């Protein structure tokens, strides 16, 4: 409901590793749609789960995102992925 809330969470907690849909730690484990889709992760729910609890080399951020923040940041990331991380 609040404009930008997911994007602001992304900047606060995720951009340091994932700005512009990349991954500065494991390059292949990026946030491009094809990369997420290959792993079955191209949904708000899957991304939210990773946001909350982490996966593999990544820790969780659910302790910092606020109630429902995992879903908010996930929805923003999915939109970006769908747009190939560029807008006009
Ligand atoms: C660097 C310290 C990171 C921060 C901050 C965040 N993530 Fe991350 N992410 C990181 C790594 C090293 C990996 C790969 C983990 C592995 O071993 O497989 C990931 C992965 C993701 C994914 C999956 C991407 C893929 O499989 O292609 C998602 C969806 C993801 N990360 C989301 C995400 C969010 C929402 C974050 C902020 C809440 C976040 N990450 C921060 C490293 C880092
Ligand atoms: Na685009």
Structural domains present in the chain: 1-88 (1.10.760.10)
Estimate to the nearest angstrom the gap between the alpha carbon of 81 and the chain centroid.
9
The CA 58 to ligand 1 mean position distance, Å, reads 5
What whole-number distance in Å separates Cα of residue 4 and Cα of residue 6? 6
Supply the angle between the helices 5-13 and 69-82 in degrees, to the nearest 10: 90
Distance between Cα 3 and ligand 1 center (Å): 23
Scored b (16 or more CB within 10 A) or e, 17-38 reads ebeebebeeeeebbbbbebbee
**PDB resolution in Å:** 1.4
Return d(Cα 71, Cα 77) in angstroms, integer.
10
Technique used to solve these coordinates: X-ray
């Amino acid at each position: 409901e609040t404009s930008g809330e997911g994007a602001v969470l992304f900047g606060q907690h995720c951009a340091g590793c994932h700005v512009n849909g990349g991954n500065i730690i494991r390059r292949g484990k990026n946030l491009k749609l094809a990369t997420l889709k290959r792993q079955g992760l191209d949904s708000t729910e899957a991304i939210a789960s990773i946001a909350r609890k982490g996966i593999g080399q990544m820790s969780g951020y659910g302790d910092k995102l606020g109630e429902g923040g995992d879903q908010l940041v996930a929805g923003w990331i999915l939109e970006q992925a769908q747009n190939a991380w560029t807008q006009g």
